[PDB]
Amino acid sequence: HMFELSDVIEGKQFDREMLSAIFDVAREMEKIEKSSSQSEILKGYLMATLFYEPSTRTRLSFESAMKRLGGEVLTTENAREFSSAAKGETLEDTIRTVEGYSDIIVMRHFESGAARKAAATANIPVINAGDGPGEHPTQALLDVYTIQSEIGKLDGISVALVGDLANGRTVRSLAYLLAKFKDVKIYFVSPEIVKMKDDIKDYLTSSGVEWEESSDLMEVASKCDVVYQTRIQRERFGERLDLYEAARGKFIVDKDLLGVMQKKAIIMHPLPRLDEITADVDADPRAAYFRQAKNGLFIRMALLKLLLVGW
Amino acid sequence: PHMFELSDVIEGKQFDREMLSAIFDVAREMEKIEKSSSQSEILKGYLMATLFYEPSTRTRLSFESAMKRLGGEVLTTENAREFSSAAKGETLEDTIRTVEGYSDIIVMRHFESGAARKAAATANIPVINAGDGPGEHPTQALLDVYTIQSEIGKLDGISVALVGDLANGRTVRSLAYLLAKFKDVKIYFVSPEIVKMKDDIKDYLTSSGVEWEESSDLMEVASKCDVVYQTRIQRERFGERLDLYEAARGKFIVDKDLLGVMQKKAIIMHPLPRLDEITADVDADPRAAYFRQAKNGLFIRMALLKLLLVGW
Amino acid sequence: HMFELSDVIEGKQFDREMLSAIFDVAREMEKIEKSSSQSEILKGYLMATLFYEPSTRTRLSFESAMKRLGGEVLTTENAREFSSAAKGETLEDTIRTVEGYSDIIVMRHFESGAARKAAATANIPVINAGDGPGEHPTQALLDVYTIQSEIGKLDGISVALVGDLANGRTVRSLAYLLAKFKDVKIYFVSPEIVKMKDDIKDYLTSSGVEWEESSDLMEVASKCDVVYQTRIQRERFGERLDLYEAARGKFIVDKDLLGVMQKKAIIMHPLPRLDEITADVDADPRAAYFRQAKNGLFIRMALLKLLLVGW
Numbered sequence: 030h031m032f033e034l035s036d037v038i039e040g041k042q043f044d045r046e047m048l049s050a051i052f053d054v055a056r057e058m059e060k061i062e063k064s065s066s067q068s069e070i071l072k073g074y075l076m077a078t079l080f081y082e083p084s085t086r087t088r089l090s091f092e093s094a095m096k097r098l099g100g101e102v103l104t105t106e107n108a109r110e111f112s113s114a115a116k117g118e119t120l121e122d123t124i125r126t127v128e129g130y131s132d133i134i135v136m137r138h139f140e141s142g143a144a145r146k147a148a149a150t151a152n153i154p155v156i157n158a159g160d161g162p163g164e165h166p167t168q169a170l171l172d173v174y175t176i177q178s179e180i181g182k183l184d185g186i187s188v189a190l191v192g193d194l195a196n197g198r199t200v201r202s203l204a205y206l207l208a209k210f211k212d213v214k215i216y217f218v219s220p221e222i223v224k225m226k227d228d229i230k231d232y233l234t235s236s237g238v239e240w241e242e243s244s245d246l247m248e249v250a251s252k253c254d255v256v257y258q259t260r261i262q263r264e265r266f267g268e269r270l271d272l273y274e275a276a277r278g279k280f281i282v283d284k285d286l287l288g289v290m291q292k293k294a295i296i297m298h299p300l301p302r303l304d305e306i307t308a309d310v311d312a313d314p315r316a317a318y319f320r321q322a323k324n325g326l327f328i329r330m331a332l333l334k335l336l337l338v339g340w
Numbered sequence: 341p342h343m344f345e346l347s348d349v350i351e352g353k354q355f356d357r358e359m360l361s362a363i364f365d366v367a368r369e370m371e372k373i374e375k376s377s378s379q380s381e382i383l384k385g386y387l388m389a390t391l392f393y394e395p396s397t398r399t400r401l402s403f404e405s406a407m408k409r410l411g412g413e414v415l416t417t418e419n420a421r422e423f424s425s426a427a428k429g430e431t432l433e434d435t436i437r438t439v440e441g442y443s444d445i446i447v448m449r450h451f452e453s454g455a456a457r458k459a460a461a462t463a464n465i466p467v468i469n470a471g472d473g474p475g476e477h478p479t480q481a482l483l484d485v486y487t488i489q490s491e492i493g494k495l496d497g498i499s500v501a502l503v504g505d506l507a508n509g510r511t512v513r514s515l516a517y518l519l520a521k522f523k524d525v526k527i528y529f530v531s532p533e534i535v536k537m538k539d540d541i542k543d544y545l546t547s548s549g550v551e552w553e554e555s556s557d558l559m560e561v562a563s564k565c566d567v568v569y570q571t572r573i574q575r576e577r578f579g580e581r582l583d584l585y586e587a588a589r590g591k592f593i594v595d596k597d598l599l600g601v602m603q604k605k606a607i608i609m610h611p612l613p614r615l616d617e618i619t620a621d622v623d624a625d626p627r628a629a630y631f632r633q634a635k636n637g638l639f640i641r642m643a644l645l646k647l648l649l650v651g652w
Numbered sequence: 653h654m655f656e657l658s659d660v661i662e663g664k665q666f667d668r669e670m671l672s673a674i675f676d677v678a679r680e681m682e683k684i685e686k687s688s689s690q691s692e693i694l695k696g697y698l699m700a701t702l703f704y705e706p707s708t709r710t711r712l713s714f715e716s717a718m719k720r721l722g723g724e725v726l727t728t729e730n731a732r733e734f735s736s737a738a739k740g741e742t743l744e745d746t747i748r749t750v751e752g753y754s755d756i757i758v759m760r761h762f763e764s765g766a767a768r769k770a771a772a773t774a775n776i777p778v779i780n781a782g783d784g785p786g787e788h789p790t791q792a793l794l795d796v797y798t799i800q801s802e803i804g805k806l807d808g809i810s811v812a813l814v815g816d817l818a819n820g821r822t823v824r825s826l827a828y829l830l831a832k833f834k835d836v837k838i839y840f841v842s843p844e845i846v847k848m849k850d851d852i853k854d855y856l857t858s859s860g861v862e863w864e865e866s867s868d869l870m871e872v873a874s875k876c877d878v879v880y881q882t883r884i885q886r887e888r889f890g891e892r893l894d895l896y897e898a899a900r901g902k903f904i905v906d907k908d909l910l911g912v913m914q915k916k917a918i919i920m921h922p923l924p925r926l927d928e929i930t931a932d933v934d935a936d937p938r939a940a941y942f943r944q945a946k947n948g949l950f951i952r953m954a955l956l957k958l959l960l961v962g963w
């Protein structure tokens with residue numbers, strides 16, 4: 030039976046029941062990945078990757094997912110220089126060409142809106158691996174799955190979203206999906222200059238999600254099941270050096286922060302990180318960001334299976 | 341069963357009519373394999389090494405897909421100038437001798453004409469020329485002729501328009517060369533005056549029994565042809581005269597008005613990539629064949645890999 | 653039983669008995685590679701490559717080795733620009749990410765010491781494919797295998813190491829392995845600016861290996877079993893292109909040099925070469941550098957097999 034989605038492009042394609050069913054499949058994929066026996070679920074299928082921006086986690090997890098299921102991969106790892114995009118070929122022409130060689134396309138473009146255009150052009154499934162600074166739906170899926178896996182529930186949780194909330198596609202998209210669950214509380218922890226935009230705030234309010242803004246990470250972290258960290262780039266302060274200095278050292282996950290957190294809470298980060306999570310934190314079992322990346326393998330295995338062979 | 345008569349695929353002149361027709365029959369067999377649900381194991385155990393010194397979408401990915409659709413594997417070198425030890429200064433001959441130690445067939449797109457021939461002479465395994473700088477692109481010519489046969493139903497007795505920079509055009513020259521292997525073919529040359537087809541092709545066509553005609557009226561030509569083969573006007577060929585490039589670029593466009601004069605079962609081809617020389621409108625017409633053409637490259641390259649590695 | 657090494661990082665990890673046993677495995681891998689049947693020894697296993705500097709032989713021989721054994725490969729063939737290392741990600745974060753997708757990591761880095769750091773971080777085997785101008789243990793293994801194959805002995809051999817010794821991660825690791833044999837003599841022949849570094853000299857002296865510096869390549873070549881030529885390592889000279897050009901052209905293997913060498917002696921070179929072996933040498937049966945590179949396939953097959961499935 031076919032998967033109801035023809036492409037995986039944006040968070041709004043998913044409802045709670047679909048998320049639960051996908052997560053069920055991802056748990057089965059964990060069993061497959063831990064086995065000694067090579068799976069042949071996707072034997073005979075080919076994935077074409079089209080990476081127009083750099084990637085470590087999303088590119089390698091999709092390729093590993095395909096090969097762990099017995100499929101194969103045709104990679105284009107830097108499309109703007111190594112493909113005929115370098116000769117001016119449009120996205121739509123690239124898609125209509127590559128679909129002749131493959132059964133599914135995984136694309137990370139440089140412009141928001143590209144993934145939807147690719148899906149509309151292609152007659153094979155497309156997965157958005159990051160749409161420039163826009164949607165990154167499989168990151169949001171693996172983030173929610175990781176919370177469920179680590180905490181054991183999604184209803185009734187408290188999540189701190191930390192860092193560049195105004196511009197951060199990962200925190201915005203995670204908030205969007207968490208709103209499909211019940212009794213969720215979200216804390217928006219950031220300097221005022223990069224606070225969460227009103228579109229997400231209004232959506233959470235309409236969805237019955239309680240939310241609170243704070244600039245006090247130490248206070249918030251003691252009350253949360255999940256601290257989900259992102260960086261605030263220096264450039265986001267613009268010429269306001271005063272605000273950069275006022276925020277300095279206040280939005281970092283360090284050993285002192287772990288000291289106020291609950292024993293069963295976790296630290297998440299979509300990666301890559303820089304110094305906004307210190308290396309000491311890594312030694313704590315609650316540091317979940319590498320387990321989170323591994324969960325992307327299982328989620329992407331699930332999606333490849335569903336899009337290519339269905340339920 | 342017998343050995344393929346070619347040890348390498350380097351240039352159009354290696355092919356005669358009989359060989360072309362036989363390869364096209366193998367390509368039709370490969371289309372049946374590619375459509376099947378069962379994974380082929382014809383090339384299980386064989387390894388292809390790619391060596392791409394210039395960018396590619398169609399040629400690189402179709403060869404890799406062809407190999408994997410037949411059950412073989414691929415070792416890719418996707419930007420050889422930068423990430424291979426050619427970046428350290430290595431000669432082509434040393435690269436080829438090295439890579440043959442790891443692989444069973446080499447597919448190479450170089451930037452210098454004559455590289456493919458030098459690679460075949462060095463290697464003791466088959467080499468396929470995936471484009472040779474200003475030189476030949478033989479598998480493109482094979483897939484072009486195959487596409488005409490598949491779309492029109494015949495090669496003898498067809499009319500083909502070749503459009504663009506004909507003076508420097510690699511694909512139009514090689515297509516003309518192979519079409520001359522068939523009978524009662526007529527070719528129309530449509531180009532800006534500055535980049536007309538060179539005399540070497542004109543004389544070969546007349547010598548080979550192909551009628552040809554130059555025209556500056558694409559609307560008149562297109563109404564009389566089974567195939568309109570469009571190409572991209574490229575800046576590099578105009579040297580330090582950007583003004584001449586811009587003048588040439590606008591002249592011969594395949595647009596809705598041109599499709600409106602074409603025959604009901606004619607086709608538009610283009611080796612790709614295109615810029616604006618085929619408008620987006622044309623894509624909506626069933627006669628726009630350039631994406632089917634690219635797909636046919638998969639079947640042709642499957643056929644060549646099979647023939648070169650395991651024979652007829 | 654399990655292989656006694658958990659990673660292949662440094663020449664000093666190998667003792668004489670281990671080298672002889674690895675060479676026996678490599679001979680079995682040669683039989684596999686020459687056979688018409690596809691091996692499935694490593695079916696189900698995935699190798700991740702991480703190449704932060706260019707490579708032809710090391711990269712392709714490892715990938716070919718893995719596929720010839722029936723495994724699969726996830727490539728990052730330009731990690732500095734095409735992975736998230738371009739965004740500042742530390743090596744330790746890259747390793748902990750990639751290990752979630754793979755069973756073994758093969759890494760070439762531009763910084764000496766990187767492979768040992770990776771091994772200390774990863775809970776899967778790591779193979780050093782070259783760590784800056786530091787070491788290159790698998791080149792050293794294939795080099796010693798080649799000497800044994802071509803000369804028929806390692807004890808009592810005389811080896812000339814020629815060219816850029818200072819920066820030559822090849823000759824550094826090779827020196828470490830040659831010291832495991834008896835009655836060896838090594839000649840160092842180089843421009844003064846790139847003479848062998850003191851760490852290697854001190855190690856050979858402490859191991860009882862005779863060594864001698866000389867600037868007379870014709871004299872040295874006439875009395876050696878092996879003349880091991882190298883490329884002047886331009887990428888290690890930084891901005892000192894004056895010193896780079898001064899170091900070239902001083903020591904050339906040409907027909908005149910072969911004319912003074914013994915009939916049983918060989919020329920080796922890890923490759924690529926530029927001008928330092930003339931093309932007319934290639935026709936001489938003693939020119940062993942292409943056989944050497946082929947032997948790398950068998951040695952790397954052996955290491956992948958041993959690290960993943962044991963003896």
Ligand SMILES: O=C(O)C[C@H](NC(=O)CP(=O)(O)O)C(=O)O
Binds near residue numbers: 709822882883
């Ligand atoms: O590059 C050299 O000159 C020697 C040595 N060469 C190799 O390992 C072969 P490659 O660089 O093609 O992998 C190296 O240290 O990288």
